Structures are given as structure tokens and as C-alpha cells.
Amino acid sequence: IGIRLTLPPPKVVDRWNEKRAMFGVYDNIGILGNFEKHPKELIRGPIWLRGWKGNELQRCIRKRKMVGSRMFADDLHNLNKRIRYLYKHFNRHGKFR
Amino acid sequence: FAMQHARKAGLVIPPEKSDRSIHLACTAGIFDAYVPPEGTMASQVSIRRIKDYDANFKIKDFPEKAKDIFIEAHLCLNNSDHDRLHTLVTEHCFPDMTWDIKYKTVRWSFVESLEPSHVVQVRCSSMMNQGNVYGQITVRMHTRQTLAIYDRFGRLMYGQEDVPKDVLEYVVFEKQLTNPYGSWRMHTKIVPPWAPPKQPILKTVMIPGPQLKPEEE
Amino acid sequence: ARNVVYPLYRLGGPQLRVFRTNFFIQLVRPGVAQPEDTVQFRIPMEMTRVDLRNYLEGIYNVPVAAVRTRVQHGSNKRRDHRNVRIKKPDYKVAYVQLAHGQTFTFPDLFPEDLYSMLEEERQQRQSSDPRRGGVPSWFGL
Amino acid sequence: GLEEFFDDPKNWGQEKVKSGAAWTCQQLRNKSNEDLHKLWYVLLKERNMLLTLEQEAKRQRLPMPSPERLDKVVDSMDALDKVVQEREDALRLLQTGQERARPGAWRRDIFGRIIWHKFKQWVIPWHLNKRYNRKRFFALPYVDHFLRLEREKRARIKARKENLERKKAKILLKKFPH
Amino acid sequence: LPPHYRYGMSPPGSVADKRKNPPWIRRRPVVVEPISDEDWYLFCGDTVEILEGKDAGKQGKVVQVIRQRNWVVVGGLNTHYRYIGKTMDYRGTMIPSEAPLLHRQVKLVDPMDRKPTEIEWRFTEAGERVRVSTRSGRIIPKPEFPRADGIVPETWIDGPKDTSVEDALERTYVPCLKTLQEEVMEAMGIKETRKYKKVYWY
Amino acid sequence: VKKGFRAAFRFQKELERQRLLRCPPP
Amino acid sequence: LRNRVTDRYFRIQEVLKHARHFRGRKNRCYRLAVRTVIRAF
Amino acid sequence: GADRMSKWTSKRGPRSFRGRKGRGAKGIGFLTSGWRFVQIKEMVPEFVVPDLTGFKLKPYVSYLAPESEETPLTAAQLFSEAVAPAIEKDFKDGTFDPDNLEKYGFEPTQEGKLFQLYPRNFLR
Amino acid sequence: KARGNEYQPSNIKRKNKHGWVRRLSTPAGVQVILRRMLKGRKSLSH
RNA sequence: CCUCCGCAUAAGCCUGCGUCAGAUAACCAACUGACAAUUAACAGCCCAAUAUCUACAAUCAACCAACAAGUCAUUAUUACCCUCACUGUCAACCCAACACAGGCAUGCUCAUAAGGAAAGGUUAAAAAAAGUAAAAGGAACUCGGCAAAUCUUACCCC
RNA sequence: GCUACCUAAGAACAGCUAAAAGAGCACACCCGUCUAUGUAGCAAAAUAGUGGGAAGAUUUAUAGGUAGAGGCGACAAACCUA
RNA sequence: GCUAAACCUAGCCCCAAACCCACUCCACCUUACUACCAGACAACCUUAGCCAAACCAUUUACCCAAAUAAAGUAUAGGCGAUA
Ligand SMILES: [Mg+2]
Ligand SMILES: [Mg+2]
Ligand SMILES: [Mg+2]
Ligand SMILES: [Mg+2]
Ligand SMILES: [Mg+2]
Ligand SMILES: [Mg+2]
Ligand SMILES: [Mg+2]
Ligand SMILES: [Mg+2]
Ligand SMILES: [Mg+2]
Ligand SMILES: [Mg+2]
Ligand SMILES: [Mg+2]
Ligand SMILES: [Mg+2]
Ligand SMILES: [Mg+2]
Ligand SMILES: [Mg+2]
Ligand SMILES: [Mg+2]
Ligand SMILES: [Mg+2]
Ligand SMILES: [Mg+2]
Ligand SMILES: [Mg+2]
Ligand SMILES: [Mg+2]
Ligand SMILES: [Mg+2]
Ligand SMILES: [Mg+2]
Ligand SMILES: [Mg+2]
Ligand SMILES: [Mg+2]
Ligand SMILES: [Mg+2]
Ligand SMILES: [Mg+2]
Ligand SMILES: [Mg+2]
């Protein structure tokens, strides 16, 4: 059996808090701030993911190129293995060839 | 056999050392048994101590509240209101009253009181009770009630709900003086020997005899 | 002392002396019958018969005649709920043959309220006879 | 001669033996020195007696009357040793200015794990003996890899700990209003 | 002790405690609001008032406290009932047993007003600790209590193995700068003509 | 444990239906 | 695991309902009834 | 196969290891000339035991003794309380210098002293 | 004839073949110790 | 009624059928918890240096008799006070995934002074396995005298 | 640490013939020719019997050595932890 | 009706920021966790290969120091794959 007999606790979801009320704000700062800043420097996150999108290959190559020297041993090792596998996969495997 | 089996098994233990103490609300047993007949200054000093510890206290009003507590405790037995039954009954009086009645209901109604309940004696406890004290009162009660006991399956064990029967008892109440929240509660019963036996049960009964371990005797 | 470096002695040098010793001894009752003059001690793995001799002669001022040594192996068979082996600590043993006429014998040590309320209630309780039929013995009717 | 391995025989078979308070390190400091040398042997005799009582109690399969008495005398001897060791510490630091009272030095082993290697008492010099020369107090290049790996591992454990305690604070502050 | 341990009513090491929490048990933890020892203002033996739970709207004396769970054990308040006799043949005599209570659930009491009044944690001008009452300020003293180590510090008698107070307090120290071993040596009167020869250290 | 409570709600409804079939009130 | 099915019980038990009256282990088990219910239909 | 977690000991090995291992007992002598052992009274320890005659102290302390705030001893305190009186009296009355320091008490060279302090020869 | 009895125990041979000192003398014997403490095994050597 | 096994040492494992209590092929327990235990003379744990000496086997070592040519020693000088400490000492035990019909060097016992128990109970069907006995014949079976029995000759290939 | 081979220093080989023996019968010991059983077995190669050698090119205990593009091998493409 | 079933915590993953470790009671390179004696003994070497090339033999991306762009251009290459 996988189903549960009794119900779970009811979720409290405060739809009016700091982030949910201030959400999306200062996203047009570039458009109506005399273009002093672009919204892409607004997002807080990794250094290689800032106003940039890409698939697995692009993301891993960008990671190792940008912050690769700061990587741990096992992490860089499995990252290189991943990009090697993905190279040969994306280039050799699938339909449309 | 507890200590012997403990030593033989190897469950050696130190005595429980802790600042906390097990607090109770009713002393076990009784201080003075009014052995009834076939049918004083000590009690005066007892009442003096009662008044000292609790100025708001009267004697002649005590039998009324005693009878009330009796009949309401029996009503609480009928209704199975164990919480208030506890609040109004002591931990010594709860088991003997509520142990055997499990797996069965009960019926008890108060018809009237032939004679008015009457105080017999009063006793006061010494200070050497875990640094606390407790006061006891005895009251004779002569009334007429009905009793009917249905078992698990709803069949009468004995008694009839329609016919009351004259009855006499000596009830004993007690109260905790040290705390102010303690109230008078039923404690025990005397069941004197000279009193006659109650009504037997409609059912017949046997007993197992001495089981002769395989050796005659 | 245990777990303490000693000064290396070389020829023509001073004499080693202990002031605040650390060795602790366990006088015990034997399981096997030794003669009357014999005594049995349980002690650490570092001591020896000569320093135990000096120990007893200085501390307790008792004449000692001979001493034998033994080691006991703590059983490493026990296993916790993790199936990890629990080992009991080892210990050395010293059998001391005493002086001229001491003739020691291990003496006997252990020859010889809420509870009161409990036993009061117990001896006040009365077992319901079978004639009652499992009826409560409380009601009057 | 041997009765001092046992308490007063009137206390035998007794469940509760009287026992005084433990020793104060401040008191031992204020006291003399040879008095402390004597009290050491006093506590030694007492400790032997108590431990004999404990072992015999375990043998007879019974508990002991006064358990805390033991750790009392134990902590007393501990504070005594601490006081005397502090006296000799101050004395050494006044005379020379050394705090450890035993020669040592930070040295890198072959595993790269630098450690405070202590010195032993030797008769002949280290350059002439042969046993000491094999200990090989130095690491080679290939060990730097493993050192980096253990460094990364320590980083992982630490980061896990900080993230977990942050999560704990976050959940409890979520649940409680404050 | 094991991690994530449950500090129930019983103390550590007790048979009940170890049977309730064996070494292998791993149950869910308990969420207790953080409470520093400085912010803590509840000591044993102090009068307390309760206004919720069972028997709400009462007051009593604290029997003890558990600082881990922020629990208070008050005598005769919030009491259920339990048997203690051997249930094998005897029914088991019934007795009341107290329940714990949280600090947010319990309230303190003023000795004079004997009413529930909030508390603050101040420093008296003479120093250096005081617990003060709400709107109408009253200093709250600490309850007196027999320490567990010594059953009585006043009604104490010197045993044979106990030392006298004058002997314990009297000091015989001499700042002589001399080593313990050497001073013991000349106190004995012993001497040793042989000098310790040098040795190498490595 | 599986997240979500819509299925748990549906199953509570089925449980109470089964309970009514087993011991339906008068 | 991020997306998991919770209503599998019901989606199988409607088929078990259609298959109650069958004989043998078909009525009880699922894969044995799936091969049969479509056949009955 | 064999057990690893169990500590290596004198019990486990053959004749040679059983004989050579040892269970932590420290040395007392040497061995020469056909397994003839030789101990020495210079390497043997000698327990120094004082007489307890006229001895007041007792292993336990009564609760009547007042509690005392802790003041751990230290070198600065020791020097200021013990030697500073001599230093200051000789200063303000006589004359002295960095020399003549052994008079006040000081070991500029440790060796030549029986009880060395670093490396310390004695034990405890 | 019959197999299974390959391990005829000898503590001397064991401590010589798979011993701390041998591992520390050969370089690769140090690499095994490092791999093993990195994994966290209790017995770094035999 | 068996004993081709036993006793011990070496090697190896490490408290693993000793006392006490417990529930849990049969559960004496070989299972759990506590307690105790194996005491060195037996065996390990050794040798201050320099230079120097050391042809001639053992085989009862005698004769004979050899070939594969063999397991043993000191000497002069210097220095050299003290003393017997430490460690193993248990068991129904080791390696084979098991309390396995397997493997395991050595001294003594050579049928045991020691150590063990093939049959849980009943009936005495088939088929099957291990044996005993067999009328007359004695390889006619069979690829082949495989097997069992008994003690038997002669001849070929390699 | 089984196994192939080797090194160091060791040990075992009754009794009867012959009286010299890489000789014969024959225990212990080593090996595994033949037969039956067993085949998730007593056993991941065994058991009962019968068999070859058993003073030598014999067997074997102990510590060490030769490490894979390799070792070792009285070459079976053997053996080198089932 | 049994066997069973259910749970929600322990904790963990990715990021960001921030650099990081050592009883100093005894013991631990001889057989590690062993109190104590004459050795002269020390490292500095291209990575290869699978695979792709539909076999394979030249060759076949794998970082080493600013994100994007120039640019997948100039170039290289059994001028093929590909780099
Ligand atoms: Mg010994
Ligand atoms: Mg293993
Ligand atoms: Mg294997
Ligand atoms: Mg072998
Ligand atoms: Mg000897
Ligand atoms: Mg033995
Ligand atoms: Mg064999
Ligand atoms: Mg026999
Ligand atoms: Mg049988
Ligand atoms: Mg059979
Ligand atoms: Mg049978
Ligand atoms: Mg025939
Ligand atoms: Mg013929
Ligand atoms: Mg034919
Ligand atoms: Mg034919
Ligand atoms: Mg034919
Ligand atoms: Mg044949
Ligand atoms: Mg021959
Ligand atoms: Mg022959
Ligand atoms: Mg053949
Ligand atoms: Mg063959
Ligand atoms: Mg031959
Ligand atoms: Mg012969
Ligand atoms: Mg060939
Ligand atoms: Mg071939
Ligand atoms: Mg190539």
C-alpha cells in the first residue's frame, strides 16, 4: 500500500508576505530608470548563471571555464566525464542524422 | 521474590536518588475505627484543629453535603463520569468502587432517607505525614435505595430496580487541610461484622476443592 | 606512575624516585581456594611484582614474602545492537604470599512512608470469595 | 596492616555511609606542599578501599552504599594534581619560559599530516642511531593530492553542518511567530 | 548519551529512562523554543499560576523543573492517575501523578498580590541580579531549596573522615620557589650525592 | 511518504463509505 | 523523486471492481485481470 | 579471515611475539650472558612515603567551609608575591644588579641541577 | 584435490606481507594508506 | 557395541558446554546478562670490542666400506659492582560460508588406564544403495572377465 | 600463507627379504589406476573397496624469494588464492 | 482475524558568501599504536587506451588565469572524420 489513511496537516500559505508582495519589482528598472541597469544583473545566483541560458553541454563547459579552477577534485572529474559523454551523445546519437 | 530474582539475574540497581517526591492526596488506611455497637473531647479537639486550619467550617451542615456527595457519586457511577467521580472521591476509594464494575453497568437510585445522616466522630492527623495533614469524619447513614447490576450482556446478576431495601452504613470522609483546594471525599467503609449479610445472587456457584498433587491425602 | 615517561638511567647516575604515585589496587575475594597466607589483588597492566613489593612495604607497612603475576583477557565476544564487538578491559592480577605468620582472610562485608502505605493497603485488602460471584464488595444492597 | 583496605567494620552492611564535601582546588592552592604530598597517599588509601568495596559489591551482586564518595575523592586527587602541575608550570615559565615540560616540535610526516612530534630519551645521537633515521619526517609531492582531497572533505562536512543549523533556525522561526 | 535524545520526566540512567530510550531507538525530536540561561527566570520552589490546560485557573508550588524541555513540575496540579502495585495478582493502588507544563503555559505569581504578573530581568542598584514585577514593581526573591549534594549545610556534623573547618581553611603555604621533590627530600632529611647526567632528546 | 492530499481526501471518502456499509446507522 | 502517482489504488480498483465476480486469482490480482477484462468487454 | 579491529597484543602471536611484545610494563634492567637478567637499584623506583603521625587533614571536607572564588596560580602572581619583597627591599636599602641573581633565586643554566625543569628528569 | 583451504594462517607472514612498515617503505604502500584513511576505514593497514 | 583414535607440543583462533538467573532434534545449553579465571622452574624475551684460530663427516663409529664429501669447538689483551625482571599459560578451539563423513607437522601410546555411540518410535511393500548364501553349468553375458571371486600360464605393440 | 620452482636451516620413514641397490613384499606416509554411490552432494571434487610408490629424482612443517608486455614450468599452452 | 498497512523526522543536494585543520597525560615507521644504542639507504621521465573515423594504421575536443562578440572566421587535416 502507498496511500495514507489520515490526511496531512493543512498547509499555511501566507499569500501576503515580503517576497510575495514585492515580487517582480524593479524588473523594468532598465526600461524606466533611464537604462542605468539591466535586469539581468538583478538576479542573485551562481556566477556562470546570470542572464544566460543553455543546455547541459553549454552549462557544464561554462562552469568549468569560469569557476573550474575552484572546483573540487571529484566534482571536476565527474564534470569532465559528463561533458565527454554528452559530447559523444549529442553528436552521435538520436534521430535526424 | 523481587530482590532474589534480581540478584540471581544480575539486575543490580542503585536506589532512586532525586529531589522530587511522590505527592498524594489521601492517606492509606484509617486513624481510628468507630467499632459500632450491637445496634468526646478527642473529637472536640479534632474539630478545633479543623476550624484552625479552615475557619470556614460547620458541623451540622456536614451530613447534608455528605448524603449529597454519596448519591451524586452513585449517579456518577451510573453515568460513568469518572473525572468528577475522581474529583469527589479519593484514590483509596476509587479502586474498590470502580474495579469490579468494569465490563458491566450499574443502577442506583436514592428513594429517601429514613433517618437523617448523623456524625459519629472526627479525627485529625499528626504533622508527621510527609509534612502534611488530613482530617477524617465518620457519619452513619440510614436510607432506602435500589440496586441492579447488568453484566456485559445486559442480564441481571442480582437486585431489582423497583423494590428498595432499607440499608445502614457508616461512611467515612476525609480532606486535605495542607492545601486549600482539597475537599471532603469518601475514603473507606467499616463493614462491621455484626451487621447481617447482604442479599445473595440469583445464580448458583461452586468452588474447586483442594487439588491433590499426585499423592493422596 | 602510569602514562608517564621515566628518566633514562645510565651508569653512575642518580636513583629513580616516585613521590605522587598513580597506581591503584583492588583487593578482591578469590574464586578459587588459595591458602590462608595468600592474598589476591587486581591491578593495572603496567605494575610488576617488585614495584608492588615496594608499594605495599612503604604505603601499608606490611611484610611481603613472594609475589606472582598474571594477566586476564577481557572477553571480546559481546556484541552491541550494531553487531560491533564490545571488549571488557583487561587487568593484571597479583598473588601475594605473605610474611611469616600474617594468615589473611577476606572478611565479610554485607551480612545484613510510601512503602508503609503500600503494605498497609495490601494487608487491608481482602480477596473476594468465590461465593460473591464477581460482584463488587462495596455496595450495601 | 590490611584493615585499611576496608572501612570501619561498623559501617559494614550499612546502606548509607556518611561522606563529606569534596576538595577545592583553591584550598589546595592555599595549602602547603608536603601536606599535599601526604593527602595524596591518604586519598590513595581511601580510593583503594572504595574500589575494593565496589568490586566486592559487584561480586556479591549488590549495589554500593555511597557511590558519589568515589568520584568525590577522584575529583579531589584531580584538583590536587592540577594545582601541583600549575605550580610547576609557573616555576618553569619563570625559570626558562617553557610551558609543555617535554621537548617537541611541529613536523610533517610522510602522510603530509603535520603533527607535534614529541621527543624521547635517547643515549646516543640521532645522527648515529639507525632506528630513528627511518621515521622519514617529510612528505613527497604525490601526497598533496590526498591532502587536497581531505581538505575538500572537511569543507563538505562543515558546509553540511552550517546548512543544517540554518535550516533548523529557519524552521523554528517559521513555526514560532517570533 | 545518544544524539536527539528525549528528556522525559525520568532522569538519565534510571531503569525507566533506559527502557523508554534504549541505545537503538531513533524517534522524532522535539521542537523547543530557544531559551538562554540569562532569559530564564523560573527557579524551583517558586509559586506559579496556571490558566489553561487541566484544572485551569489555579496556583501552586513548583516541585521541580526540566530546563531542556522547558518543563515545570508543580505539586498536585495537572494530575492524572496511575497504578503502582504489582499488577500480576494485585490490582495496583492508584495515585496521582503530575504532568509537565511549558514556560509559556505557566505564569508567575507575586507573593503579596498573589496574582499572575509578568516578569522582567533587571539589575538592582546594589547589584547584581534581580527579578522584578510588572506594572506595580515588586522585587521577587529566589525560593530556598536543599541542594542535592549536601542534604543539610547547617545541620552538618564532622565525621571521622571529614576534616575540621579550621584545619581546612588554615593555610600553611610558603612561597619558597623550591621544587616539590627537593623540598620533600630535605624535609625527609635525605640527600643524593649523584648528579643527573645529560641525555639526548629526539 | 508521497506528497499531496487530493488522493488522501478521496480515500477518506471511500473509507467512510465502507464504514457506513459495514455499520450503517439507523 | 519529485512527481509520483497517488491515485494508483483507485485506477486499479475500478478494474478490480469489474473483475470481482471472476474465479481464481484473476479477481484478486491485477495483471491477471487486465488480460481478462478487455477480453470480457 | 583474521580479525583486524581487535588490538594487537602479546597473546596472539607465536613464541617470539608472545615473548617480545610486552603489555606496557616499563623497563627495570638488562639481559645478557645466556638469558641472565640484571636489575639495578638505580632504575628501580623507590616510593617515598611520609609518616602520618600527628596529621590533622582528612580526605573529605565538611560543608561548613565557606565557598571561595577561584584564583588560579600563575607566574606573575608568584613572582610579585614571593620575590618582589626581597627585590624591592634590596633596591630601596642596598644595591644590586642583573648579576648576583642566584641569591634571589634563579637557574640561568638548568643542567648541573639535579631536578631539571626542561627537559624535566623527575616524574610527577 | 579439494579447495577452500588456501588461507593457512600465519601471523608472521601476515604482518610481513600486509604490514604497516612494508606499506610505509614502498611508496604505493603509502598511497594505499592515504586512499584508505580518505575513505575512513578503521584499519589503515592489516 | 566401537575405537585408524587418544594425550600433549608446535602452529592457529581468542573466553567460545565453569557458577548463578532468564526466555528461547531436544532447548546440558554450545543463546543472553553478571561473576570468577590461565600464578614459572616449562618456552620466548640475550651475548662489549680488536685481531686471531678452526683440513681429517654421520651411519651404536669399532672393523670393513665408500661417495653425493658432509649440522656443532677457540685463542691473547682490554673493560666488566649489581641480579632473576617482562611476556604465553583457559576452553569441547585451527582452515573449509555450517557444531561439515574434508585438509592439518611433531614426541608417546599400537590397542589402548584414554576417547566415543552407528539404531527418535512402529511396519518389515515396491524401486534404489551396501553386503552374505546358492542347485547343475562356469564367461555361453559383455566392445572388453567392468565388477565380484580365486591366486594363474604363455605371447605381442609402444 | 593454495599452487610451479628455488634458498636457509630442520624433521619423518616400522617390520620382512636382499644384505651393494634411484632393488623387492609390506605399515605409517604420498599419490589418485579401476568400480559403485553421491550429483543444491558429507564435500563448490568427497565416501567404501581395490590400487602405484613408499631409503629416495622421496614426503613434509617453518621463514624468505621470482608479479602479469611478467614469473615458473621433467611444455600438459600446466600452475600463479575454488 | 492474523500477517500486515499508514505516518515525518533524522538528515541530505545545489548555490552564495567565507578560506581551512590540528591533547601540548603516555604510545605509535621493529610485527605501527612497542619507554632506552654506531645506519650512512633516499623523489624529480611525453600518459596510454577505449571510442569516432561506420574496418584501421596519420588523426580524434578534455580547460588553466575577463563573461559576451569577432567566430565556429583565419587556419590545420588519410584537406575526411574532426581539431
Ligand atoms: Mg608469567
Ligand atoms: Mg577479515
Ligand atoms: Mg574463500
Ligand atoms: Mg602449507
Ligand atoms: Mg627458563
Ligand atoms: Mg596451555
Ligand atoms: Mg593435508
Ligand atoms: Mg573410555
Ligand atoms: Mg543415532
Ligand atoms: Mg541414520
Ligand atoms: Mg528412522
Ligand atoms: Mg550358482
Ligand atoms: Mg576361459
Ligand atoms: Mg553373447
Ligand atoms: Mg561373448
Ligand atoms: Mg567384444
Ligand atoms: Mg576385476
Ligand atoms: Mg625401492
Ligand atoms: Mg616396495
Ligand atoms: Mg584409467
Ligand atoms: Mg584418472
Ligand atoms: Mg619406487
Ligand atoms: Mg626399511
Ligand atoms: Mg605438447
Ligand atoms: Mg594444444
Ligand atoms: Mg593511434
PDB file of C-alpha atoms in Angstrom, chain A residues 44-87:
ATOM      1  CA  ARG A  44      21.115  36.572  -7.285  1.00  0.00           C
ATOM      2  CA  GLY A  45      22.670  33.244  -8.193  1.00  0.00           C
ATOM      3  CA  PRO A  46      25.720  31.402  -9.490  1.00  0.00           C
ATOM      4  CA  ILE A  47      28.387  33.356 -11.313  1.00  0.00           C
ATOM      5  CA  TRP A  48      28.041  31.314 -14.519  1.00  0.00           C
ATOM      6  CA  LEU A  49      24.221  31.565 -14.480  1.00  0.00           C
ATOM      7  CA  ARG A  50      23.473  35.283 -14.744  1.00  0.00           C
ATOM      8  CA  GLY A  51      21.472  36.346 -17.772  1.00  0.00           C
ATOM      9  CA  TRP A  52      22.396  33.191 -19.657  1.00  0.00           C
ATOM     10  CA  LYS A  53      20.596  30.017 -20.683  1.00  0.00           C
ATOM     11  CA  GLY A  54      21.956  26.819 -22.142  1.00  0.00           C
ATOM     12  CA  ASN A  55      21.580  23.071 -22.261  1.00  0.00           C
ATOM     13  CA  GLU A  56      23.682  20.534 -20.366  1.00  0.00           C
ATOM     14  CA  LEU A  57      26.794  20.840 -22.537  1.00  0.00           C
ATOM     15  CA  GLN A  58      26.776  24.626 -22.564  1.00  0.00           C
ATOM     16  CA  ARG A  59      26.198  24.828 -18.819  1.00  0.00           C
ATOM     17  CA  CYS A  60      28.964  22.374 -17.926  1.00  0.00           C
ATOM     18  CA  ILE A  61      31.506  23.947 -20.277  1.00  0.00           C
ATOM     19  CA  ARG A  62      30.654  27.391 -18.915  1.00  0.00           C
ATOM     20  CA  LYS A  63      31.035  26.115 -15.356  1.00  0.00           C
ATOM     21  CA  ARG A  64      34.439  24.555 -15.936  1.00  0.00           C
ATOM     22  CA  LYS A  65      35.648  27.538 -17.958  1.00  0.00           C
ATOM     23  CA  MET A  66      34.557  30.160 -15.441  1.00  0.00           C
ATOM     24  CA  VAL A  67      34.813  28.561 -11.995  1.00  0.00           C
ATOM     25  CA  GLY A  68      36.564  25.317 -12.924  1.00  0.00           C
ATOM     26  CA  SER A  69      39.782  26.073 -11.075  1.00  0.00           C
ATOM     27  CA  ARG A  70      37.835  26.440  -7.817  1.00  0.00           C
ATOM     28  CA  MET A  71      36.151  23.055  -8.282  1.00  0.00           C
ATOM     29  CA  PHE A  72      36.827  20.093  -6.051  1.00  0.00           C
ATOM     30  CA  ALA A  73      38.642  17.083  -7.468  1.00  0.00           C
ATOM     31  CA  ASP A  74      35.754  14.630  -7.730  1.00  0.00           C
ATOM     32  CA  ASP A  75      33.438  17.367  -8.980  1.00  0.00           C
ATOM     33  CA  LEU A  76      35.714  18.436 -11.820  1.00  0.00           C
ATOM     34  CA  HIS A  77      36.405  14.779 -12.636  1.00  0.00           C
ATOM     35  CA  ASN A  78      32.746  13.836 -12.985  1.00  0.00           C
ATOM     36  CA  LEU A  79      32.069  17.109 -14.799  1.00  0.00           C
ATOM     37  CA  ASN A  80      34.644  16.266 -17.449  1.00  0.00           C
ATOM     38  CA  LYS A  81      33.232  12.755 -17.718  1.00  0.00           C
ATOM     39  CA  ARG A  82      29.770  14.283 -18.130  1.00  0.00           C
ATOM     40  CA  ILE A  83      30.830  16.648 -20.900  1.00  0.00           C
ATOM     41  CA  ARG A  84      32.658  13.816 -22.660  1.00  0.00           C
ATOM     42  CA  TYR A  85      29.594  11.570 -22.560  1.00  0.00           C
ATOM     43  CA  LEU A  86      27.369  14.463 -23.635  1.00  0.00           C
ATOM     44  CA  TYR A  87      29.683  15.430 -26.475  1.00  0.00           C
TER      45      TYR A  87
END
